[PDB]
Design a protein around this ligand. Sequence first.
Ligand SMILES: [Fe+3]
Length: 858
Amino acid sequence: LVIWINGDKGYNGLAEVGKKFEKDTGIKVTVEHPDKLEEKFPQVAATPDIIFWAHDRFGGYAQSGLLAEITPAAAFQDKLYPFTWDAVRYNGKLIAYPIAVEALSLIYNKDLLPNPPKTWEEIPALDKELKAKGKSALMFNLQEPYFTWPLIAADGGYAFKYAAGKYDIKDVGVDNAGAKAGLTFLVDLIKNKHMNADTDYSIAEAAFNKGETAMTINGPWAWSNIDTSAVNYGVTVLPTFKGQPSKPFVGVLSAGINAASPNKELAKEFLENYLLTDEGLEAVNKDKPLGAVALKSYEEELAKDPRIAATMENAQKGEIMPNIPQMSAFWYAVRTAVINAASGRQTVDAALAAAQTNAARAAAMSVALASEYQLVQNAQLPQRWSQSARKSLAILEATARKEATAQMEAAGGSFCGQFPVDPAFKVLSLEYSAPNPDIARAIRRVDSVPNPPLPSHVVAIQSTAVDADLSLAMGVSLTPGRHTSYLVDARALQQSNSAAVAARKADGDKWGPACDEMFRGCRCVTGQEVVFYTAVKEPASLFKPSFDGPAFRPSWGELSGKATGVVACVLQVPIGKETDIICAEYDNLVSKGQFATVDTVNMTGNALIQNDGKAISKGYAVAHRARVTSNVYGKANDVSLQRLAETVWSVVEKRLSFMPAYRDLVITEQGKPFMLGATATNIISLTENQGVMLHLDTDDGVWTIILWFHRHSGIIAGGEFVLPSLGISFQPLDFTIVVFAANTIVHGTRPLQTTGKIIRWGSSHFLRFKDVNALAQLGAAYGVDELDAKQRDQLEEVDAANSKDGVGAARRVASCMAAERKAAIEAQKAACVRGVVMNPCTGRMPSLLFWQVWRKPP
Ligand SMILES: [Fe+3]
């Protein structure tokens, strides 16, 4: 049993609970507190056995089938308050165990305020009295609607209408009279000087803990801090409004079991019998406060503390937070409404009118986007496969193999350019000659060892008929008679990915002994053109093929009941006109200073570096400046970048016809202007004789392109590109390109040592989706073509400020532009503007595309 829980909880106490579990049963409990837990669970669970989080996010996990249905006996359900069970019900089924209950309360300073107001209506009078002594009645975080909603909801008003175990995303309750009344009262307190419309979390928490305000509104997480102050304080029921209870949202900390866990009946034993007990929860409570708990017996003990009783009281008068993803539409719309109404930028009536309409609209769009993503993940390539076609293609491929074999006889061997290719050997070092100003040419194998065999989960395809089947179905067309296709068992690929990551961690995040051991089992494919397909078995996983898709009849029976997908392809580009163009643009952009140094690696392309406050258009800072300062042609670098991306993309697409289909599928109309030309590339890297640790990428597109070329002569040892879960590695020769699914295939580059002046230039062409989303969003807010003018303006205003009042005054102006840009992006992001299609579950692109289902019934 592996359990993840947040770092601000009592995990060591929960680890003690796990220790009492390993004594009675011979089962160890290991408790991690991973960072970024909110988002890291839905990313990894899609591909711990127990997860500890607020119930509201578990509805989303349930929609994605990341949780097990919990089946407690009605005798165990009686140990817990019934509302806490509603917290953990998605679509009629129980999806987690309730642990703790949490809601806002009224917190008051006893010395300033022995009898706290029962009602909101007596607060302005009470602020009068307090104002005499230079103190305020009430100060709380007005910036986040989680805090102001209790008041707004009191007289009616709700997020989404609950009915028949479901939230109706179309029925928003922001706009009614009850809500208007509540918000009107809130802004009235501001317009009568009682509350300051600027007050946030920190301001309110400072003021109360120093004795400047009599009351604050906060939750149990805040008690610790007050405990360190000179304040004598209580915690009580929230004030009523028009005689109704303030209605705060209730968050129920819950424990859900992973749907992909083999450990279901022994996590059920652990949580029902070792944590949900008085000694179980107290163990955890000693480590860290829980506030109110769901377990009736222990709650009765904690309720002896008035603060805890007050929490449960406010919780029972409140509303349980909807466990659906569309709460984000609700929150953003209401946050804007409250900020506007409180600043006088809108009438209360106008603010809630717009919030209602916007939330409804955004909630609808998010559902539309979820259904569209499914069609993206399930989309098929234009059909070229047929039994006649694959037979025809196999003949053609078979003819090409005889030709290549005759060429190989006539020439005395196999060659990639001038480099001798012999798969009996593994190329550990190699020599390049630079006889002219063109690219240095790979000429001679220097060091070698016998070439390791393929690992057992990777098979070379021998049959031309099978070659044809995959080629047609997968949009791959490698050099006829001069390539090798491989099939990789999908389960073993995922296991080997984890082993590779483990090795890199054990080596201390570098190429060390564990990575080297793996490398020694990697077979060399230097000088080869190859493709790897992974085959997913029908469940009857890291990869998500739809087994409801159309099926083809394979000539190979072993493919039946499986789906294939392209995970990697190595091309050897013949030195010529395209390599001239590509290499020239690198040289142009290097000379003209258009590569920015980053976290090392140089980058160029259509970035949006938000850390640069004054950035408001596509490209790195040097690119913004070159458009303005040039005295010949302002778009020159943009022309050079587009030719660079398009020439690489063209060379790749000749061989891999799925690539344009992937481009057309994932780039939205709003994203197209921010790609480099008609490609799926928006960022291009450049490295000089550099290795990189084994890793998966996370926030890139489905496939990434990597290329290399060489400048002077000399010898390179090491520097192989390694794909350890595919069991292969290679030295880049004249112009090697790899196209691969970098979010799902571990990959890295070993350190190099050189003799002579030789430079190996490496370059990744990839889709960094955050930049294209932010830019698509800026395009929506300002107009695509207006960005250049805005960039030109913002550069002048900042230079003027720097030229007039110094660096600090300039960075103040940048800071101003950043906040304005941030506001514009946020509003478009909330209106669901996107540059790319993304998994709403993961916030990432799909793990692969264009799965083909094979079935051979008899
Ligand atoms: Fe990478």
